[PDB]
Structure 1
Amino acid sequence: MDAIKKKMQMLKLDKENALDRAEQAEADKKAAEDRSKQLEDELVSLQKKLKGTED
């Protein structure tokens, strides 16, 4: 009819916005966790270098 189509369009705009936000948040999580794990690896290498210096 008439109002039904507009209501469906609203329900679809919500769909697109929610899905896009979810995808963007997932990408953010991937990037942040990669950052953290690379920092942890750098910390490990520093520990090993400290061990060599102690030797």
Structure 2
Amino acid sequence: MDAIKKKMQMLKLDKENALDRAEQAEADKKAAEERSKQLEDELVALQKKLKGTEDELDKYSESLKDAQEKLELADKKAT
């Protein structure tokens, strides 16, 4: 094949190989973005579960405070 024609064939092949690289990276990028969206949703659900747990801890801490409160007034006459 003529040298000039061969060079042109190679430039075309190089372009195609690069477009293929871009297509694959763009697909991988979209995949990562979707994974990140799902992870953000997991973090929000977990944060809500933690908030619920902290609220319950406060409820227990308050109830315990009342109990130790009543226990003192109670054991006033253990004899």
Instruction: Give the CA RMSD over aligned residues.
Output: 1.5
Consecutive unaligned residues of structure 2, counting only runs of 5 or more, are 56-79
In 2, the alpha carbon distance for the partners of 1:5 and 1:32 equals 41
The 1-side partners of 2:7 and 2:26 are apart by 29
Paired residues in the alignment total 55
2:34: which partner in 1? 34
Per-residue deviation at 1:41? 0.7
Paired with 2:31 and 2:8, the residues of 1 have a C-alpha distance of: 35
Shift of 1:9: 0.6
Larger Rg: 2
User: Please, what TM-score do these two structures have when normalized by structure 2?
Assistant: 0.62
Aligned to 2:14, the other structure's residue is in SS state helix
Structure 1 runs not aligned, ≥5 long? none
Determine the C-alpha separation between the residues in 2 that align with 1:3 and 1:39: 54
Quote the sequence identity (%): 96
